[PDB]
Amino acid sequence: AFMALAYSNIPLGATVIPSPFQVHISDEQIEELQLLVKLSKLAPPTYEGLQQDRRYGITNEWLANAKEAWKSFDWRPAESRINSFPQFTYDIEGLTIHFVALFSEKKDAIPIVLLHGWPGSFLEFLPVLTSIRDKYSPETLPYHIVVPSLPGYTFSSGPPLDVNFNGEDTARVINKVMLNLGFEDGYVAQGGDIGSKIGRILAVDHDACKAVHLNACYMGKPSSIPDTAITEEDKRALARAQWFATFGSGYAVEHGTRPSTIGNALSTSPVALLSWIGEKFLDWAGETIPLETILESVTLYWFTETFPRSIYHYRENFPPPKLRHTEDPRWYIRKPFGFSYYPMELVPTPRAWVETTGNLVFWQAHEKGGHFAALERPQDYLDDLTAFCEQVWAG
Amino acid sequence: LAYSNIPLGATVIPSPFQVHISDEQIEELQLLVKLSKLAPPTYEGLQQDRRYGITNEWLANAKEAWKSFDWRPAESRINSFPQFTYDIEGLTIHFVALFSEKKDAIPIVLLHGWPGSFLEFLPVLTSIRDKYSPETLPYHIVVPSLPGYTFSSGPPLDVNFNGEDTARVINKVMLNLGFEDGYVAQGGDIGSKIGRILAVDHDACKAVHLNACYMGKPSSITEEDKRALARAQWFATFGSGYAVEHGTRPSTIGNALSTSPVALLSWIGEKFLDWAGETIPLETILESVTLYWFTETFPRSIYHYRENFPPPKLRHTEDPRWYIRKPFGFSYYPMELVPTPRAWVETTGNLVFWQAHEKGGHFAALERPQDYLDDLTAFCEQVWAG
Numbered sequence: 001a002f003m004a005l006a007y008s009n010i011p012l013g014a015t016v017i018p019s020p021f022q023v024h025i026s027d028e029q030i031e032e033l034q035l036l037v038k039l040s041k042l043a044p045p046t047y048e049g050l051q052q053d054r055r056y057g058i059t060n061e062w063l064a065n066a067k068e069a070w071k072s073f074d075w076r077p078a079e080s081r082i083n084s085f086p087q088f089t090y091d092i093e094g095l096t097i098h099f100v101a102l103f104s105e106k107k108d109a110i111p112i113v114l115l116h117g118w119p120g121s122f123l124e125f126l127p128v129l130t131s132i133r134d135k136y137s138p139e140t141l142p143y144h145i146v147v148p149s150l151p152g153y154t155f156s157s158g159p160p161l162d163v164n165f166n167g168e169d170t171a172r173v174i175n176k177v178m179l180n181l182g183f184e185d186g187y188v189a190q191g192g193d194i195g196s197k198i199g200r201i202l203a204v205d206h207d208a209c210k211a212v213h214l215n216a217c218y219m220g221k222p223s224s225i226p227d228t229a230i231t232e233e234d235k236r237a238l239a240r241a242q243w244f245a246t247f248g249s250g251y252a253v254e255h256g257t258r259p260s261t262i263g264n265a266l267s268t269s270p271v272a273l274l275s276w277i278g279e280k281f282l283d284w285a286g287e288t289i290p291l292e293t294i295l296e297s298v299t300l301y302w303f304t305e306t307f308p309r310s311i312y313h314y315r316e317n318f319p320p321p322k323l324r325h326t327e328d329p330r331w332y333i334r335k336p337f338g339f340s341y342y343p344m345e346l347v348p349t350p351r352a353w354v355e356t357t358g359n360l361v362f363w364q365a366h367e368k369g370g371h372f373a374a375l376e377r378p379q380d381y382l383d384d385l386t387a388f389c390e391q392v393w394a395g
Numbered sequence: 396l397a398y399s400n401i402p403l404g405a406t407v408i409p410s411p412f413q414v415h416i417s418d419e420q421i422e423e424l425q426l427l428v429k430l431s432k433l434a435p436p437t438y439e440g441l442q443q444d445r446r447y448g449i450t451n452e453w454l455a456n457a458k459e460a461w462k463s464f465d466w467r468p469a470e471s472r473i474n475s476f477p478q479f480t481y482d483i484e485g486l487t488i489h490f491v492a493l494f495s496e497k498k499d500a501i502p503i504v505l506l507h508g509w510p511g512s513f514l515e516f517l518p519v520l521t522s523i524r525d526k527y528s529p530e531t532l533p534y535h536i537v538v539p540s541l542p543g544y545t546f547s548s549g550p551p552l553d554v555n556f557n558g559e560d561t562a563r564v565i566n567k568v569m570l571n572l573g574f575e576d577g578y579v580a581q582g583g584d585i586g587s588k589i590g591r592i593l594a595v596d597h598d599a600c601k602a603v604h605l606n607a608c609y610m611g612k613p614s615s616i617t618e619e620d621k622r623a624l625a626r627a628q629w630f631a632t633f634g635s636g637y638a639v640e641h642g643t644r645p646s647t648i649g650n651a652l653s654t655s656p657v658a659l660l661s662w663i664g665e666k667f668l669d670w671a672g673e674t675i676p677l678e679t680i681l682e683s684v685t686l687y688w689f690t691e692t693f694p695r696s697i698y699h700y701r702e703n704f705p706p707p708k709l710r711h712t713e714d715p716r717w718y719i720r721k722p723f724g725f726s727y728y729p730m731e732l733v734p735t736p737r738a739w740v741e742t743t744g745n746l747v748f749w750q751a752h753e754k755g756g757h758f759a760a761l762e763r764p765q766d767y768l769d770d771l772t773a774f775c776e777q778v779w780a781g
């Protein structure tokens with residue numbers, strides 16, 4: 001049905017008109033989820049499950065309380081809030097690509113694509129979009145904001161069943177979203193987690209991406225630095241990165257080597273999926289992420305069968321590459337490159353490290369916030385993004 | 396039962412044990428099997444060579460077979476072997492045994508690993524009963540459930556527990572049965588680490604035979620050595636996700652796989668498929684996963700893996716602290732996870748016995764029970780000194 005929605009006017013110059021989209025999870029799926037949560041079995045007490053500091057992952061107590069809360073969680077109000085933002089799909093290379101958008105009425109608005117990672121989604125950016133639409137009407141909005149679901153995530157289909165699919169394919173398909181909307185003349189990319197790899201690939205390989213801002217730059221100490229110049233904050237950063245490599249990367253190895261096994265396993269029960277993903281919302285955040293937010297994201301993954309389709313990126317590091325992606329001259333960013341440092345990112349990277357990976361024209365450090373920067377610190381994230389775009393955009 | 400006479404000289408009489416899973420447990424399992432949901436089709440799940448793990452098709456077929464799986468015949472077969480428990484350090488320790496009538500029979504403990512159990516050794520025990528009567532049996536055979544596995548309780552809720560604790564407790568099973576004068580240990584998988592610890596640190600263990608020796612190449616070539624190195628590299632690169640996850644986030648994965656029996660089946664089935672040389676029948680996989688489910692084994696069973704996080708200076712097998720000075724034997728099965736040539740294994744102990752096989756993989760006793768028994772007999776006869 002025709003549905004007028006503010007901020008939904010397709011930019012002049014779009015070559016393909018996207019199909020309007022709204023989320024409508026069926027009643028039977030909602031009923032079913034309540035049943036499957038209720039009847040899920042819980043592990044018995046173990047030494048590891050009783051460690052309240054989560055040294056061995058989620059606690060039994062956390063999971064039992066989350067299961068109880070989930071019984072009464074109501075998807076419909078969350079769905080209504082999602083549907084207050086314009087959403088669309090395109091058909092690109094046989095994939096359905098879902099995206100959220102805020103479109104300006106200004107002919108020369110700055111186009112921006114925001115790129116989520118794993119185990120996130122477009123949901124990570126809705127607080128940011130809320131701030132944007134409260135500050136700007138469609139007529140005063142300086143930007144077009146496009147928040148796509150990566151292939152394999154939520155309402156995006158795929159990846160294909162008959163061919164391998166990697167980060168370069170992801171970037172090519174996301175670039176086509178922006179080209180379809182008429183942004184061949186240029187757009188800015190922003191990414192964290194896997195989205196930071198996609199954003200780097202867009203900036204390095206695709207003409208339409210003119211600049212990129214990242215809040216993650218996964219790398220070791222670059223070989224081109226001969227020194228050890230070491231400050232207290234640099235101490236915390238190296239310690240957290242070392243914690244992540246030794247104790248925090250089980251999911252990377254499992255996703256990267258046996259994605260079919262873990263995808264089959266976590267499809268069986270929503271509480272299996274909650275265990276796996278909840279650990280990351282708890283451990284990776286600087287600002288505590290509310291249980292309701294965790295349940296919302298895991299519920300969305302459950303309804304859309306996201307998890308088994310979402311982990312294809314991880315195998316690109318098996319066997320270990322000759323050079324890490326960020327440390328490879330093949331992927332050095334020559335275009336204007338910005339970075340924001342959040343101290344509880346998984347691998348917090350000092351400026352001197354990041355500078356070895358591209359033409360770093362913008363640097364902003366923060367005192368608060370971790371891996372889920374937009375979700376945890378939406379206004380800090382937005383202030384960085386708009387400052388970067390206004391600094392680098394050349395019309 | 397034949398072979399159930401407790402050896403004379405046992406200092407603690409073990410309590411007889413039988414498996415009797417309740418109808419309620421069986422029907423709870425079938426409920427949750429039927430409730431389980433399948434993955435959507437994915438590229439990774441369509442790879443018939445299992446390069447990314449189990450196929451979606453294998454799991455769907457295995458789930459369907461599970462709905463027709465009857466636990467009671469399997470349970471009856473288990474209960475056809477003498478079984479017992481001891482209370483050791485506040486743990487219930489289950490074990491299967493065949494006891495000889497010969498006063499000076501050679502005692503042997505057979506040590507399972509993960510995701511195995513005493514079930515792995517029942518074909519060997521069957522071979523033993525086919526070959527010997529209680530009067531002619533040369534050995535006392537003890538097959539314990541490690542702490543945290545199937546009918547053994549624990550590990551403790553309030554303190555950490557490691558391989559040295561495991562060996563201390565298992566040694567006490569043998570001491571309780573009167574074997575302080577000596578016994579032989581045999582191990583694969585984590586059982587090979589337990590067997591090494593027994594031989595190095597415990598007086599009553601007089602010799603040890605291993606069918607795994609997890610190590611890198613010592614700093615000090617045939618086509619077989621080439622295939623061995625390639626398999627070891629495959630295991631290190633693509634086969635060790637479960638090690639990192641078990642070793643760093645055991646509570647997360649223990650909680651996740653406890654929610655659904657089909658989650659557990661996915662995780663464990665992959666290993667019975669990839670680790671075997673001889674194809675392991677689906678029924679055998681279902682029996683093992685079913686037993687793990689009824690006994691809530693999985694979250695209790697993975698405590699060993701965190702011992703290598705952070706990675707120690709030297710691998711356990713390569714550490715002089717764990718060099719085996721007592722008589723040490725090794726059997727090479729080509730589809731072991733890290734197949735180790737003789738010159739490698741020899742650096743880790745007083746290797747007096749070597750046997751190579753053309754067939755068989757990681758689950759040597761389960762896959763090749765006659766070869767396993769032949770090796771065990773040959774080793775014990777060579778090294779036992781009264």
Ligand SMILES: [Cl-]
Pocket residue numbers: 115190191192193195215373374
């Ligand atoms: Cl981001």
Ligand code: NA
Pocket residue numbers: 114115116121122147148149150
């Ligand atoms: Na996104």
